[PDB]
A paper describes a structure:
It recognizes and disables oxidized nucleotides through removal of a pyrophosphate from the damaged nucleotide, which subsequently prevents their incorporation in DNA or RNA. The substrate recognition site is adjacent to and mostly separate from the catalytic site and in [name] it contains a hydrogen-bonding recognition element in the form of an Asp-Asp motif. This motif is unique to [name] within the set of human Nudix hydrolases and is important for substrate recognition.
To further highlight the variability in the hydrogen bonding patterns seen with the Asp-Asp recognition element, we discuss here the structures obtained with compounds 5, 6, and 7. Their binding modes are shown in Fig 7 and it is interesting to note that none of the fragment binding modes resemble the binding modes II, III and IV seen in Fig 2. The distances to the aspartate oxygens (2.5 Å and 3.2 Å) of Asp120 suggest a strong hydrogen bond.
Author numbering: 3 to 156
């Protein structure tokens, strides 16, 4: 019982682009760009589409970097999140009524204002590692348990 999602991190050598969601799921937190995958759409095309819809950026090359399954206790649907990374983009990040994008220096990533799981896997992403993860949450702030391992193939 899992639903596909995408998550894209525009990660350059000294900085990463994050977006502050204004409403809905995860509002008030800095996050990568993504959302649900459409019927008849590949996960990668879904990731490219969501990056444009949410950030206004056009991605050329996308690299798979991780897979993370999220469980929210009491919610039937598991989120199967396919994480991607890019250093090659076109355009300038667009602020919209839904999203406020901002570039962060790598030593200044706002972990306290991000989903709690990011403190676990962002260190791997920053060191160009690939990973498989699972996080069980109680509500939106508490991680009850988790698993996270590095992999050669996502
Ligand atoms: C539930 N955890 C996460 C959801 C999401 O959209 N992005 C994260 O980094 N983590």
């Amino acid at each position: 019982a899992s639903r596909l999602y995408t998550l894209v991190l525009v990660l350059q050598p000294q900085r990463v682009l994050l977006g502050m969601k204004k409403r809905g799921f995860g509002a008030g937190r800095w996050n990568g760009f993504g959302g649900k995958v459409q019927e008849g759409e590949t996960i990668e095309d879904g990731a490219r589409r969501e990056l444009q819809e949410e950030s206004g950026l056009t991605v050329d090359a996308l690299h798979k970097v991780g897979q993370i399954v999220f469980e929210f206790v009491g919610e039937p649907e598991l989120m199967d999140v396919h994480v991607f990374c890019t250093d090659s983009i076109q355009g300038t990040p667009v602020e919209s009524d839904e999203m406020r994008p901002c570039w962060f220096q790598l030593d200044q990533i706002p972990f306290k204002d991000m989903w709690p799981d990011d403190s676990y896997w962002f260190p791997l992403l920053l060191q160009k590692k690939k990973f498989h993860g699972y996080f069980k949450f109680q509500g939106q702030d508490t991680i009850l348990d988790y698993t996270l391992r590095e992999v050669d193939t996502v």
